[PDB]
Amino acid sequence: ADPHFLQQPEDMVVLLGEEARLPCALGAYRGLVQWTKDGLALGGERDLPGWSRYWISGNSASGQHDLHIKPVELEDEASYECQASQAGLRSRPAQLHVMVPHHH
């Protein structure tokens, strides 16, 4: 079978300072998987070097490639895609909304 998504991320709202999980799963695909943030590719290495608060979790052999962000910051509000780079397959874009908690 051809490469295909088994799970795709969706629009979500997360609180400032919490952890975000943007899910992605691919079937019949053994190549590079990575995430883009407003069109900027973050890279394929699982700990995402250069992005101290981002990493990819999940068993890559089983096809899971979830993007995690912790702690979430205001600058994380963006449109994210999961991409199978070698097959040209792109997920639906997922908008991450960051809400600031108000306290007193």
* Contact set with a copy of itself (CB under 8 A): 31-32, 34, 36, 39-45, 49-51, 81, 83, 85-88, 90
Q: CA distances (Å), 61 to each of 29, 32, 33, 64, in order?
A: 9, 11, 11, 8
Among 5, 29, 35, 54, binds Na ion (CB under 5 A): 54
> Which one among 22, 33, 42, 48 touches Na ion, defined by CB under 5 A?
48
Provide, rounded to whole angstroms, the least separation between the CB of residue 87 and Na ion: 13
Asked if 36 contacts 25 with a C-beta cutoff of 8 angstroms, the reply is no
22 or 48: CB nearest Na ion: 48
Find tokens 């199978």 and name the residue: 84
| Residue 91 CB neighbour total at 10 angstroms | 22
As measured in angstroms, the least distance from the Cβ of 51 to Na ion is 4
What six digits make up the tokens of 69?
């962000």
